[PDB]
Design an enzyme around this catalytic site. Structure first.
Site, PDB file in Angstrom:
ATOM      1  N   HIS A 166       0.835  -1.023  -0.172  1.00 35.78           N
ATOM      2  CA  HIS A 166      -0.030  -0.081  -0.068  1.00 35.78           C
ATOM      3  C   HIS A 166       0.806   1.408   0.080  1.00 35.78           C
ATOM      4  O   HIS A 166       2.057   1.165   0.635  1.00 35.78           O
ATOM      5  CB  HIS A 166      -1.008  -0.017   1.174  1.00 35.78           C
ATOM      6  CG  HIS A 166      -0.230  -0.002   2.435  1.00 35.78           C
ATOM      7  ND1 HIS A 166       0.132  -1.043   3.360  1.00 35.78           N
ATOM      8  CD2 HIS A 166      -0.095   1.395   3.180  1.00 35.78           C
ATOM      9  CE1 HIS A 166       0.723  -0.464   4.467  1.00 35.78           C
ATOM     10  NE2 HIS A 166       0.569   0.901   4.360  1.00 35.78           N
TER      11      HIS A 166
ATOM     12  N   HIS B 214       1.964   3.958   1.392  1.00 36.44           N
ATOM     13  CA  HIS B 214       2.222   4.850   2.623  1.00 36.44           C
ATOM     14  C   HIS B 214       3.636   5.214   2.754  1.00 36.44           C
ATOM     15  O   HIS B 214       4.425   4.470   2.047  1.00 36.44           O
ATOM     16  CB  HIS B 214       1.695   4.137   3.739  1.00 36.44           C
ATOM     17  CG  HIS B 214       0.160   4.489   4.301  1.00 36.44           C
ATOM     18  ND1 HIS B 214      -0.542   3.883   5.163  1.00 36.44           N
ATOM     19  CD2 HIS B 214      -0.452   5.365   3.572  1.00 36.44           C
ATOM     20  CE1 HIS B 214      -1.615   4.489   5.233  1.00 36.44           C
ATOM     21  NE2 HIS B 214      -1.739   5.327   4.360  1.00 36.44           N
TER      22      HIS B 214
ATOM     23  N   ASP C 166       5.821   4.939   5.051  1.00 43.39           N
ATOM     24  CA  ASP C 166       6.629   3.756   5.608  1.00 43.39           C
ATOM     25  C   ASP C 166       6.909   2.721   4.802  1.00 43.39           C
ATOM     26  O   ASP C 166       7.407   1.414   5.332  1.00 43.39           O
ATOM     27  CB  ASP C 166       6.043   3.479   7.042  1.00 43.39           C
ATOM     28  CG  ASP C 166       4.716   2.893   7.095  1.00 43.39           C
ATOM     29  OD1 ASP C 166       3.972   3.255   5.952  1.00 43.39           O
ATOM     30  OD2 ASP C 166       4.386   2.120   7.782  1.00 43.39           O
ATOM     31  N   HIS C 167       6.346   2.453   3.545  1.00 44.27           N
ATOM     32  CA  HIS C 167       6.543   1.374   2.568  1.00 44.27           C
ATOM     33  C   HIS C 167       6.822   1.685   1.414  1.00 44.27           C
ATOM     34  O   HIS C 167       7.633   1.143   0.612  1.00 44.27           O
ATOM     35  CB  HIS C 167       5.152   0.590   2.893  1.00 44.27           C
ATOM     36  CG  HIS C 167       4.628   0.258   4.146  1.00 44.27           C
ATOM     37  ND1 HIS C 167       5.632  -0.683   4.825  1.00 44.27           N
ATOM     38  CD2 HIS C 167       3.746   0.636   4.799  1.00 44.27           C
ATOM     39  CE1 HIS C 167       4.819  -0.880   6.301  1.00 44.27           C
ATOM     40  NE2 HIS C 167       3.700  -0.081   6.204  1.00 44.27           N
TER      41      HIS C 167
ATOM     42  N   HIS D  63       5.056  -4.980   8.023  1.00 42.77           N
ATOM     43  CA  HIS D  63       5.721  -4.987   9.448  1.00 42.77           C
ATOM     44  C   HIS D  63       5.803  -6.339   9.862  1.00 42.77           C
ATOM     45  O   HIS D  63       4.859  -6.917  10.057  1.00 42.77           O
ATOM     46  CB  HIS D  63       4.550  -4.274  10.404  1.00 42.77           C
ATOM     47  CG  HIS D  63       4.864  -2.479  10.002  1.00 42.77           C
ATOM     48  ND1 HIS D  63       5.723  -1.770  10.235  1.00 42.77           N
ATOM     49  CD2 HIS D  63       3.662  -2.122   9.417  1.00 42.77           C
ATOM     50  CE1 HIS D  63       5.508  -0.507   9.901  1.00 42.77           C
ATOM     51  NE2 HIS D  63       4.014  -0.672   9.467  1.00 42.77           N
TER      52      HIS D  63
ATOM     53  N   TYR E 165      -8.439   5.205  12.943  1.00 41.73           N
ATOM     54  CA  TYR E 165      -9.357   5.363  11.736  1.00 41.73           C
ATOM     55  C   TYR E 165     -10.943   5.572  12.252  1.00 41.73           C
ATOM     56  O   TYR E 165     -11.285   4.775  13.352  1.00 41.73           O
ATOM     57  CB  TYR E 165      -9.389   4.218  10.830  1.00 41.73           C
ATOM     58  CG  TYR E 165      -8.239   4.030   9.963  1.00 41.73           C
ATOM     59  CD1 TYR E 165      -7.108   5.075   9.969  1.00 41.73           C
ATOM     60  CD2 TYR E 165      -7.987   3.105   8.895  1.00 41.73           C
ATOM     61  CE1 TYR E 165      -5.915   4.735   9.244  1.00 41.73           C
ATOM     62  CE2 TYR E 165      -6.844   3.208   8.384  1.00 41.73           C
ATOM     63  CZ  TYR E 165      -5.943   3.939   8.392  1.00 41.73           C
ATOM     64  OH  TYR E 165      -4.804   4.020   7.602  1.00 41.73           O
TER      65      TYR E 165
HETATM   66 ZN   LIG Z   1       2.539   0.729   8.173  1.00 41.86          ZN
END
Ligand SMILES: [Zn+2]
Ligand SMILES: [Zn+2]
Ligand SMILES: [Zn+2]
Ligand SMILES: [Zn+2]
Lengths: 264, 264, 264, 264
Positions: free
Chosen positions: B82, B84, B86-87, B223, B189
């Site tokens: 996805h 984001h 951090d990826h 993660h 969320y």
């Molecule tokens: Zn994440």
């Protein structure tokens, strides 16, 4: 032996026959052609356009908007059923001359951004001028312009980003639930075992049930023949119009018959 | 009273701790950090990278690829779980220095194109350099690089374009079904009644069943803690790793508990 | 009275006549048609393609690359003279099937991104499938692939992003300075008082002097007739080829004569 | 030894100090902060915004527009000097909440599209939310909104797409030629021998003469200190303001001195 020349996207003459603005409800008007739907919604804070038809219809759309007392700068938002050349054609030109924004889902946005090129079924045969999406909408997200709320309903099938729009207008004060559902056909599509669309059958079946449950008192389609509309007769245009159940049930019968003969 | 200054996206020190390439299968390697997964797949026709971690990891990823005998021009494709920060952080920089292409679905493409800005839940707080997608993939579409076939599995929830990738590698000739599933969490969320994501609960529930039925012999997550991986111990990294059923069932319990206290 | 149908971009049959790869230098090859230039540069680290011709030439280009022992994944970079359909046509399709990147300046990038639509002089009459630029180059920036350095030279006129590419190849060890200059014509352009291009005359005059000072031993143009090339005769193709001074001086005479009769 | 954390783009507190709308001419207003210029032009057909400042200024800009009797849907066009985070910051957010369009040249468009990332001199250190350009303007092209004509003047230097905007307003009927010129500084830039900008010195020198010949009766800059403006004193803001010749001549002296010590 020269390479073959390019071929233009030609349609029937009825798809390009201009018509005067036909009234659907108190705030909804049909300003497209005889066989192409272009819905205009006049509000107190601006106008909203749903689809536009062929790319060469940008001039005709602006003329009918001027007939309804709508200046180009009054068009606030453009909504799309699916990003094909026969519906999302003049979107690029309308953005430059009206100052309007385009709201579509991710699948319609990426298809509109490349002008319909690299189609999952048609390739580059039906290419139109590219346009960019200014707002990405989700399934069931509500868009409000001038008090009228437009709710998106994803119905993937004809294109991955096919969207049905529902809104409540009035008819001399008496409310009416209008549902502008997209096409449910698959002209020449490889239904089973398509590498470009592995989940095509699952999307069509789930979209057939989505159209049945749409809140609808008057149904409209991008092609008026699909919902048995006849814009040419004016007053009797919505006489023999189909319901949401009749439209989805008739499209599923053709889907199963096409899926059956494809395996033959 | 000046307006507040901008704040950078800071993470734990373990998310930025470089590690040597840890081997997962005959052709799969972990070249990220201790708490961020960056999978490299070496084939006969080039390398494939799944995710990249934080944006400041582009230099570390290129170093581990050189340790595996992979030149920058040998990286052929970048796949994402996805989009984001951090990826999908160093995706933009990796495209400029490796000549690789990016394959993602429409929802990940439009999110990667705007660098994670205007997030459905985070807004502009987690922004990374934008990158463009070169190939739009559909649900269940197969991508082959050097004989290894990667199948996409849509699991919308954390982001609308969350995708699980499954492929079959070997372990000294003995095959192994690897499933790189995305996150199933929802940190902060608004689950119920979210105007930016009206069908959020329906997507999470449908994604929980999607992860359960994934063809998997060894599960990996962006993660490593989510799938009980421990890259720090090297040999014993996959010792206590979770199955697809255990990972989806544990994430659904946290989802229902979070959904229950949200109504409180 | 229906609206007029769309018309496809038709060209001469010689523009679509496939030809075998004609050798220009030790590493430079012409792999296009008789009247459309498509330069291929084979290096030790990959191949480089300059222009592609008409959109329906993607299949012919891949065939000639295979004849030169160049796999699709070996094409590393695509360079463009100007983003028109008769030169940058198959760029979108070549990116999907070769894994190559596209390097162009900002003006060519924004024109290639919208598929030539909304042209400053042609409008939407010459539309091709859109493609995205992966690297933005500046005036005089050097691009190196496999040891061969390509230097960009901006020459705005035909399009705002017209670029001449110069590189040094060899002829049996003896070096040769090749200059691939863009077109300097203005077919049907409004030269004086153009609201879409107010500084058009200043750009053409400054581009004429730019072509004169280009380091060149052998000149090539996107249309071989402009530089008096004849790809059909094979060995005698570069016999009567023009210099950089002769090509720029002849184009300026036609520019002044066209500018003079425009005021009449 | 973990990799270094990300660092946010921090500025002086005066750059984020909100101020009430200061009037410049009959239709021109300053609605930014003390050390960041955000020009608003109220016309009979809508408002025009030039620059926006830091990304966290979108809320302050909308408040001052409401003070001037300008609804969000009344903002028709956004113009930019150069696409950096301290000027084109809130452009993305303003497009979503106002329905306005953005007009910029090709170089500013490609820089705004990637949110300032991959800067020629700053890299990814100064990244802001990305925004798309709806209209590509050329050098000297005229843009008219509500009768007021805005003429673009390219001045490449600080960025490749730096643009000075000139328009004629009034002061109680008496006309005034306003010229909003961009910055001419080069903070930490490699002036000579820059591989990312080989023609940097030629662009600065040509831009210095461009600023001198701008039709100007009152000069404004994105940073008010460059033109000796002081928004804090209100009435005496334009007291000691510099001319176009004084501003360009002072910037060239600093350019030559910086270019001289760079060779040392
Ligand atoms: Zn994440
Ligand atoms: Zn149709
Ligand atoms: Zn041409
Ligand atoms: Zn600045």
């Amino acid at each position: 032996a020269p390479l073959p020349q390019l071929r233009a996207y030609t349609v029937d003459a009825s798809w390009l026959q201009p018509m005067a603005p036909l009234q659907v409800a108190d705030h909804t008007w049909q300003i497209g052609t005889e066989d192409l739907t272009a819905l205009l919604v006049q509000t107190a804070e601006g106008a909203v356009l749903l689809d536009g038809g062929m790319p060469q219809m940008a001039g005709h759309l602006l003329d009918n908007m001027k007939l309804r007392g709508v200046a180009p700068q009054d068009l606030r938002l453009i909504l799309l059923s699916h990003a094909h050349a026969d519906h999302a054609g003049p979107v690029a030109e309308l953005k430059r001359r009206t100052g309007a924004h385009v709201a579509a889902n991710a699948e319609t946005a990426v298809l509109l951004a490349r002008g319909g090129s690299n189609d999952l079924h048609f390739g580059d045969g039906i290419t139109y001028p590219p346009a960019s999406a200014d707002r990405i909408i989700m399934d069931g997200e509500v868009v409000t312009v001038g008090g009228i709320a437009f709710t998106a309903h994803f119905m993937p099938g004809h294109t991955p980003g096919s969207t049905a729009w529902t809104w409540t207008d009035t008819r001399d004060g008496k409310p009416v639930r209008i549902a502008y559902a997209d096409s449910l056909s698959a002209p020449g599509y490889q239904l089973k075992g398509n590498p470009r669309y592995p989940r095509l059958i699952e999307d069509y079946k789930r979209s057939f049930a989505t159209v049945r449950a749409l809140p609808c008192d008057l149904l409209l389609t991008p092609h008026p023949g699909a919902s048995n509309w006849n814009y040419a007769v004016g007053s009797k245009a919505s006489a023999e119009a189909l319901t949401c159940n009749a439209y989805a049930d008739a499209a599923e019968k053709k889907f199963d018959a096409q899926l059956a003969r494809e395996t033959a």
